[PDB]
Curated annotation (Swiss-Prot), chain A:
WD repeats: 10-53, 58-97, 100-139, 142-183, 184-223, 226-265, 268-300
Cell location: Nucleus; Cytoplasm
GO biological process, one term: nuclear-transcribed mRNA catabolic process, 3'-5' exonucleolytic nonsense-mediated decay
InterPro entries hit by this protein: G-protein_beta_WD-40_rep, SKI8, WD40/YVTN_repeat-like_dom_sf, WD40_repeat_CS, WD40_repeat_dom_sf, WD40_rpt
Protein name as catalogued: Superkiller complex protein 8
The species this protein was found in: Homo sapiens
Superkingdom classification of source: Eukaryota
Function of the protein: Component of the PAF1 complex (PAF1C) which has multiple functions during transcription by RNA polymerase II and is implicated in regulation of development and maintenance of embryonic stem cell pluripotency. PAF1C associates with RNA polymerase II through interaction with POLR2A CTD non-phosphorylated and 'Ser-2'- and 'Ser-5'-phosphorylated forms and is involved in transcriptional elongation, acting both independently and synergistically with TCEA1 and in cooperation with the DSIF complex and HTATSF1. PAF1C is required for transcription of Hox and Wnt target genes.
Keywords tagged on the record: Acetylation, Cytoplasm, Nucleus, Repeat, Transcription, Transcription regulation, WD repeat, Wnt signaling pathway
PROSITE patterns linked to this entry: WD_REPEATS_1, WD_REPEATS_2, WD_REPEATS_REGION
CDD domains: WD40
Similarity-based family: Belongs to the SKI8 family.
Self-association and partners: Component of the PAF1 complex, which consists of CDC73, PAF1, LEO1, CTR9, RTF1 and SKIC8. The PAF1 complex interacts with PHF5A. Within the PAF1 complex interacts directly with PHF5A. Component of the SKI complex which consists of SKIC2, SKIC3 and SKIC8.
Swiss-Prot record, chain B:
Name the UniProt record assigns to this protein: Parafibromin
Family: Belongs to the CDC73 family.
Subunit structure, as described in the record: Component of the PAF1 complex, which consists of CDC73, PAF1, LEO1, CTR9, RTF1 and SKIC8. The PAF1 complex interacts with PHF5A. Within the PAF1 complex interacts directly with PHF5A. Interacts with POLR2A, CPSF1, CPSF4, CSTF2, KMT2A/MLL1 and CTNNB1. Interacts with a Set1-like complex that has histone methyltransferase activity and methylates histone H3. Found in a complex with BCL9L or BCL9, CDC73, CTNNB1 and PYGO1 indicative for the participation in a nuclear Wnt signaling complex. Interacts with PTPN11. Interacts with SETD5. (Microbial infection) The PAF1 complex interacts with Zika virus French Polynesia 10087PF/2013 non-structural protein 5/NS5. The interaction with viral NS5 proteins may reduce the antiviral immune response by inhibiting the recruitment of the PAF1 complex to interferon-stimulated genes, thus preventing their transcription.
Reported tissue expression: Found in adrenal and parathyroid glands, kidney and heart.
Disease entry from the Swiss-Prot or TrEMBL record: Hyperparathyroidism 1: An autosomal dominant disorder characterized by hypercalcemia, elevated parathyroid hormone (PTH) levels, and uniglandular or multiglandular parathyroid hyperplasia, adenomas, and carcinomas.
Positions of region (Interaction with CTNNB1): 1-33
Protein purpose: Tumor suppressor probably involved in transcriptional and post-transcriptional control pathways. May be involved in cell cycle progression through the regulation of cyclin D1/PRAD1 expression. Component of the PAF1 complex (PAF1C) which has multiple functions during transcription by RNA polymerase II and is implicated in regulation of development and maintenance of embryonic stem cell pluripotency.
Source organism per UniProt: Homo sapiens
Highest taxon listed in the record's lineage: Eukaryota
Coiled-coil blocks: none
Maturation and modification: Phosphorylated. Dephosphorylated by PTPN11.
Swiss-Prot record, chain D:
TPR repeat extents: 19-51, 58-91, 104-137, 138-171, 173-205, 220-253, 254-287, 288-321, 324-357
Gene: CTR9
Localization annotation: Nucleus speckle
Natural source organism: Homo sapiens
Function: Component of the PAF1 complex (PAF1C) which has multiple functions during transcription by RNA polymerase II and is implicated in regulation of development and maintenance of embryonic stem cell pluripotency. PAF1C associates with RNA polymerase II through interaction with POLR2A CTD non-phosphorylated and 'Ser-2'- and 'Ser-5'-phosphorylated forms and is involved in transcriptional elongation, acting both independently and synergistically with TCEA1 and in cooperation with the DSIF complex and HTATSF1. PAF1C is required for transcription of Hox and Wnt target genes.
Designated name of the protein: RNA polymerase-associated protein CTR9 homolog
Subunit structure, as described in the record: Component of the PAF1 complex, which consists of CDC73, PAF1, LEO1, CTR9, RTF1 and SKIC8. The PAF1 complex interacts with PHF5A. Interacts with KMT2A/MLL1. Interacts with STAT3. Interacts with SETD5. Interacts with ERCC6. (Microbial infection) The PAF1 complex interacts with Zika virus French Polynesia 10087PF/2013 non-structural protein 5/NS5. The interaction with viral NS5 proteins may reduce the antiviral immune response by inhibiting the recruitment of the PAF1 complex to interferon-stimulated genes, thus preventing their transcription.
Range within the parent protein: 394 to 852 of 1173
Tissue: Widely expressed.
Species lineage: Eukaryota, Metazoa, Chordata, Craniata, Vertebrata
Length: 300, 43, 149, 459
């Protein structure tokens, strides 16, 4: 339980998200990050060292979300420029640019089958664009204030959504219909992700509580006291034994998904951490933030 | 019950709402009300 | 105005290398807002100072509020307003070296004003943003007042 | 207290088998420097073991742990509280000193610490353990609502605070908390005067807290275009009278001068607002309000160099990173190179946390237009920038098209976007004119490099 690699000055501007692979499709070894300096750096974590492989540009505004396709070695990057641009980690070239105009562009959500791309809309709906089409296939008719977070389940059975007022919207990607609407929070939900078994659902609201709800029966499994600041990013260990939590207080707490206890905490970041993600096995925990330093956290 | 008078009689409250309002130093109104009246005289 | 610099400081160490003289000592002070170093040398005899004391140091190019840029001469018979009326320790010197971390391409980010009050030195090391009012070969004052807090 | 301090200074030097002298030393220094009391308890803890093997009573360990609770030694204070609880439990025969009350207060401090130790579950459990044994206690029942209030101001907080007032209406803290409830939604602007005037009876008087709450709620009514109707001037006079009244009876109250400076700034005296705010800053500048009221004066006098740092410092607190109001106050009259392109970076940082605000989406377009007109009117500058300016202008135009459809605005309709559209149109024309200049500079540099290469061939 410590830190292995320490990338100083990973970017010119603050990093807001980090993407790292989990499968063997040339993704777990390459780290894709998106920062506000309009630099989509494709870092290759080769030889247990963070080396730069590609440097993709083109986004007018800073990168808001980065994620790696599960069954595919390509990637994509969105921003607030309403131009969601697809990329390829095999050549460092651009596939296309989905002009999600005029401003309606938010964090990305790669489908586990790597065939659909969910994007938040200012009208409150969740637009589901096609990866190889780019056109608006079908939109979820659940209006409200705005979609602040969207996550796909690893096996593709459910889909949740974080609103500006703590409204979880459990959709069904198998049929495209709203099943449950968990409203256990009143704070703007920052980010969320599905458990490796698609059984638990963590919510990172702005109250400092890690309220882990259930998806099968839409019920709260227990209130976990998180940090003092707002939990920004949250990820599950691929082996499904723990889950890290990124907050706005220079703290990287690794809470236990089973006992609801902090098993270790990092304080190596001088600024707030914005993105946290696991490795393909769950030992290395990559992290980014306003410090503009990528820390690789090893927890054997 | 006696548990109320049992605690409020032995404790000590060094700071409360009003304490937060006054500065811990000595800043009287002689240097404040002077300008407060000067601004009014010019108008 | 003429306020070349204004900031609160606090004493943290006196004569670290051992007090050499008997009336002067080093004051390795630090700031509270701008985060700048200070190596002021005050007359410990007439103006004693201990650790932890805070003071409002204000480098001013002149002692007048209107800023008439006095020529420089001892003229006690003067009824004009003076900024020294609210300071317990004032000095008069002339900065002689402005060192900084300049390079061949990009401008400096941290300067270091070296001023000599007729023998008493003072290094106001810090960022290169608030030291714009310091130019080599120019008269300046100190105007420091200890804070009672 | 001065005579007691002198007497303790006399008993400190000599050693007439002092046992409780340090206890009296620390009992006075709790209000003063918190390290003196800690030193006294440190020595008093070891002085109780030489006469006999007697365990330290829980009251001293409890008070030393309370001293450390305010400090950064949260874990050490936690150990002190746990050991105090263990020791107080051992007092099966100290029914006269009421070991039970000692355990109650120790656990109260321990729950306050857990609430402060990023563990609200244990704090809730401990405060409820106090509730189940003594429902006539107020502070535990009031802190529980604070904990539920973090998640939202409509949960059990608003109910527990009123139940706490209903059990004790003569409790100033509970009633002030009641007034604090209405502050989340300022729709109760004029109506909150009634509920803030409940305990203004002479028996409770004088209460500076409620009077300054009245002054604040009366200041909130300012910043309106109805001042010429002789309405806001009367409001300023009323608030000024309130502040004068709380100044005469308390000259050391900083908030009275804070509000007086606020109104004087509202009266158009910014040259004279710095002097009034100076005393408040020098007394204690570590209050969120002063950093902003002073930064307003600095940003008013064309001093953004002295205003951006004040806005950054207020954000140094561990409560947030990108606040909307601070950045809104950040960009006021920025026109310099380091205050426009970077202003876009801070605007995007702000909009990242909550893009639903219209003012951010309008200010980003305005600064984009400022840069475009700053590179497409008198320039004659680098070429790649002329390539990027058209993209920025297109994005600004798309945002102009999008902003017009929104219903609600910043209490002011944005129908004045037409001039922005005309400005962007003539900017487009100028850009299509200046791209030709870009190409001309391209051929110029090409011929320059050729005429240099020929000379190098000569050599």
């Amino acid at each position: 339980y410590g830190i292995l690699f320490k990338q100083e000055q990973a970017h010119d501007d603050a990093i807001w998200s980090v993407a790292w692979g989990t499968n063997k499709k040339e993704n777990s070894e390459t780290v894709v990050t998106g920062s506000l300096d309009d630099l989509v750096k494709v870092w290759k974590w080769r030889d247990e060292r963070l080396d730069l492989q590609w440097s993709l540009e083109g986004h007018q505004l800073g990168v808001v979300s980065v994620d790696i396709s599960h069954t595919l070695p390509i990637a994509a990057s969105s921003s607030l420029d309403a131009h969601i641009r697809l990329w390829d980690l095999e050549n460092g070239k651009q596939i296309k640019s989905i002009d999600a105009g005029p401003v309606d562009a938010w964090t990305l959500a790669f489908s586990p089958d790597s065939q659909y791309l969910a994007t938040g809309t200012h009208v409150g709906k969740v637009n589901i664009f096609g990866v190889e089409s780019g056109k608006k296939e079908y939109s979820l008719d659940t209006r409200g204030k705005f979609i602040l977070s969207i996550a796909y389940s690893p096996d593709g059975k459910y889909l949740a959504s974080g609103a500006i007022d703590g409204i979880i919207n459990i959709f069904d990607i198998a049929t495209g219909k709203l099943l449950h609407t968990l409203e256990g929070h009143a704070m703007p939900i920052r980010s969320l992700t599905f458990s490796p078994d698609s059984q638990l659902l963590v919510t990172a609201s702005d109250d400092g509580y890690i309220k882990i709800y259930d998806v099968q029966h839409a019920n709260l499994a227990g209130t976990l006291s998180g940090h003092a600041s707002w939990v920004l990013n949250v990820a599950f260990c691929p082996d499904d034994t723990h889950f890290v939590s990124s907050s706005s207080d220079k703290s990287v707490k690794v809470w236990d998904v089973g006992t609801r206890t902090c098993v270790h905490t990092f304080f190596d970041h001088q600024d707030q951490v914005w993105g946290v993600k696991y490795n393909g096995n769950g030992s290395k925990i990559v992290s980014v933030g306003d410090d503009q330093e990528i820390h690789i956290y090893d927890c054997p | 019950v006696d548990v109320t008078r049992d605690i409020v009689s032995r404790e000590r409250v060094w700071r409360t709402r009003t304490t937060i309002l006054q500065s811990t130093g000595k800043n009287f109104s002689k240097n404040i009300f002077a300008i407060l009246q000067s601004v009014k005289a010019r108008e | 105005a003429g306020i070349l610099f204004e900031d609160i400081f606090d004493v943290k160490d006196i004569d670290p290398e051992g007090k050499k003289f008997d009336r002067v000592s080093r004051l390795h002070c630090e700031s509270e807002s701008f985060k700048m170093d200070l190596i002021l040398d005050v007359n410990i005899q007439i103006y004693p100072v201990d650790l932890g004391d805070k003071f409002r140091l204000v480098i001013a190019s002149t002692l007048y509020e209107d800023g008439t840029l006095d020529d420089g001469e001892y003229n006690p018979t003067d009824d004009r307003p003076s900024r020294a009326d609210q300071f317990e320790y004032v000095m008069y010197g002339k900065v002689y070296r402005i060192e900084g971390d300049e390079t061949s391409t990009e401008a400096a980010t941290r300067l270091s004003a070296y001023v000599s009050y007729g023998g008493l030195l003072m290094r106001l090391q810090g960022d290169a943003n608030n030291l714009h009012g310091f130019e080599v070969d120019s008269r300046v004052y100190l105007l420091m007042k200890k804070l009672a807090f | 207290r001065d005579i007691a301090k002198g007497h303790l200074k006399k008993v400190t030097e000599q050693y007439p088998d002092d046992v409780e002298a340090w206890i009296e030393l620390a009992q006075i220094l709790e209000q003063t420097d918190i390290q003196g009391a800690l030193s006294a308890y440190g020595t008093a803890t070891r002085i109780l073991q030489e006469k006999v093997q007697a365990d330290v009573p829980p009251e001293i360990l409890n008070n030393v742990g309370a001293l450390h609770f305010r400090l950064g030694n949260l874990g050490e204070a936690k150990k002190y509280f746990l050991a105090s609880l263990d020791r107080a439990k051992a007092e099966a025969e100290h029914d006269e000193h009421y070991y039970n009350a000692i355990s109650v207060t120790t656990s109260y401090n321990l729950a306050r610490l857990y609430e402060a130790m990023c563990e609200f579950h244990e704090a809730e459990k401990l405060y409820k353990n106090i509730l189940r044994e003594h429902p006539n206690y107020v502070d535990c029942y009031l802190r529980l609502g604070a904990m539920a209030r973090d998640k939202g101001n409509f949960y059990e907080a608003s109910d527990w605070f009123k139940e706490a007032l209903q059990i004790n209406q003569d409790h100033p803290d509970a009633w002030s908390l009641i007034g604090n409830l209405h502050l989340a939604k300022q729709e109760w602007g004029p109506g909150q005067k009634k509920f803030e005037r409940i305990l203004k009876q002479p028996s409770t008087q004088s209460d500076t807290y409620s009077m300054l709450a009245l002054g604040n709620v009366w200041l909130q009514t300012l910043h309106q275009p109805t001042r010429d109707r002789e309405k806001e001037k009367r409001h300023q006079d009323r608030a000024l009278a309130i502040y004068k009244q709380v100044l005469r009876n308390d000259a050391k109250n900083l908030y009275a001068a804070n509000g007086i400076g606020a109104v004087l700034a509202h009266k158009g005296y910014f040259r004279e607002a710095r002097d009034v705010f100076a005393q408040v800053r020098e007394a204690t500048a570590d209050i969120s309000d002063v950093w902003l009221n002073l930064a307003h004066i600095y940003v008013e006098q064309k001093q953004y160099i002295s205003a951006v740092q004040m806005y950054e410092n207020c954000l140094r607190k561990f409560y947030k990173h990108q606040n909307t109001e601070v950045v809104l106050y950040l960009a006021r009259a920025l026109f310099k190179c380091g205050k426009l392109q970077e202003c876009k970076q801070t605007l995007l940082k702000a909009r990242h946390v909550a893009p639903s605000d219209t003012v951010l989406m309008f200010n980003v377009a305005l600064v984009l237009q400022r840069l475009a007109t700053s590179v497409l009117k008198d320039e004659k500058s680098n070429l790649k920038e002329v390539l990027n300016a058209v993209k920025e202008l297109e994005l600004a135009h798309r945002y102009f098209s999008y902003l017009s459809k929104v219903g609600d605005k910043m209490r002011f309709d944005l129908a004045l976007a037409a001039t922005e559209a005309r400005q962007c149109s003539d900017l487009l024309s100028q850009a299509q004119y200046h791209v030709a200049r870009a190409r001309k500079q391209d051929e110029e540099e090409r011929e320059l490099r050729a005429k240099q290469e020929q000379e190098k061939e000569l050599l």
